[model samples]
Target: MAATQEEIVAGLAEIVNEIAGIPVEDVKLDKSFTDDLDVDSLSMVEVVVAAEERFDVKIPDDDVKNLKTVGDATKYILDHQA
Candidate 1:
């Protein structure tokens, strides 16, 4: 199934809260993963891993590094799943 914007937002919020110690209420759509969420390369990997586990889907390593923002991850998941 295709992931919706709301699903992406919610999922990203959950993942951000889980691995980064950031609260879900603090995650906004316009926030940058690195600048706002304090996500580094390792945290990005963790986020992708969490998403893969949560969604039961795989995001290739080569593509993983390119996912810099929640919107990027969301769009990728939507394409990858559908």
Candidate 2:
């Protein structure tokens, strides 16, 4: 089954926390992965990998490249997870 919206949020929060070393509570949906999270391109790749592992879904390179914010990550999960 697909994960719920809450689950996606929580999972993405965990990813941000784990890879970025930011507390879960510090993560905000509007926060841009690059600007707010202090994630460079290399770290963004790591974040995407972490998110895929957490959700057990493979995000394509094109889609992953376009993911900019927490909201984008959540939307991607909601659309792709089955």
Candidate 3:
């Protein structure tokens, strides 16, 4: 089943928090993965892998660059989840 945006955000928040060491409460949709969350490139790759597993979606390496914010990742999962 496809996930909702809210569900995607929640899942992404958990993954982001795990990899970035940010508090879940602070992982708002508007927060940038790099600027606000302090997630480095390596960490972002980890997030993508985790997200793929959590959401059952495929996020190609090229597309990973577009997911710069919490909202971006959530939307991408919501849009492409299988």
Candidate 4:
């Protein structure tokens, strides 16, 4: 897996943009998916799946709950993408 943290963030930004119409620039590390991007729990499920596919990894529902920010998600993918 050649995926990096930056790559995961960019991939996730595209997914969020398609799903929620949020600008890719706004999906930064400091922003929360629910608070900053306004993506609700339902939308989060889609995002999680998209990230899993994009990175070729798994994100269990329990793991999803702790991924509260863009940085969190990026770190998860980077760390798990052996």
Candidate 5:
């Protein structure tokens, strides 16, 4: 079944919070992963990997560049979740 946008955001919030020590409340759709969340490139890779495991979505390295903000990632996962 496809995951809902809320489900995707919640799952991503958990991963972002766990990996970067950012609070779940700070993980908004409009927030930038790097600037707002302070998530570095390496940490982002971890987020992507965890998201893949949690959501069963494939986020290629090429596509990672497009996921700059929480909203972007959420939309991608919602679109691609398997």
Candidate 6:
């Protein structure tokens, strides 16, 4: 199985848009989910759930907290996904 960094970011961006109503363009590496995308914590929980299913990876709560930026989530997904 192969998953590139850009692929994860694009996939996560889609999830973010679906869950938070933020535009896909708004979801980028440097942007913070809360500040840039205006994604609430509850919304982010859904985002994580969706991402787990979409990317076929397990993401625990402890890990979620550290995913402050889109790049962080992408890096985590890349690490966890096969």
Candidate 4, residue 34: the lDDT equals 68
Tell me the lDDT of candidate 5. 0.73
Q: What does candidate 3's lDDT look like per residue over 1-82, in tens digits? A: 5888777666777787777666766767788877887887778877656776676886775566567776777677677789
Cα lDDT computed for each candidate against the true fold: 0.67, 0.70, 0.73, 0.70, 0.73, 0.70
Off by over 4 Å in 1: 25-29
lDDT per residue as tens, model 2, 12-77: 778767666656766666888777776766666676667765766657755655777766767777
Clash numbers, per candidate? 0, 0, 0, 0, 0, 0
Q: Ten-residue segment with the worst summed lDDT in candidate 4?
A: 57-66
- Candidate 1 per-residue lDDT, tens place, 1-82, comes to 4567677667768877766655776666566676677777677777656775476555775465566665676667767764
Candidate 1 global Cα RMSD: 2.3
RMSD of each: 2.3, 2.1, 1.7, 1.8, 1.8, 2.0
How well does candidate 1 score on lDDT at residue 5?
68
List the pairs of residues colliding in candidate 6.
Answer: none
7: Cα error in model 4, Å: 1.3
lDDT of 4 at 26: 69
TM-score of each: 0.72, 0.75, 0.81, 0.80, 0.81, 0.77
Best by TM-score: 5
Q: How accurate is candidate 6 locally (lDDT)?
A: 0.70
Pairs clashing within candidate 2: none
Error in Å for residue 57 of model 3: 1.1
Off by over 4 Å in 3: none
Please give the distance, in angstroms, between residue 28's alpha carbon in candidate 4 and its true position after superposition: 1.2
Please report how far candidate 5 places residue 4 from its true position, in Å. Answer: 1.1
Q: Any idea what lDDT model 1 has?
A: 0.67
lDDT of 1 at 36: 70
* Ranked candidates, highest TM-score first: 5, 3, 4, 6, 2, 1
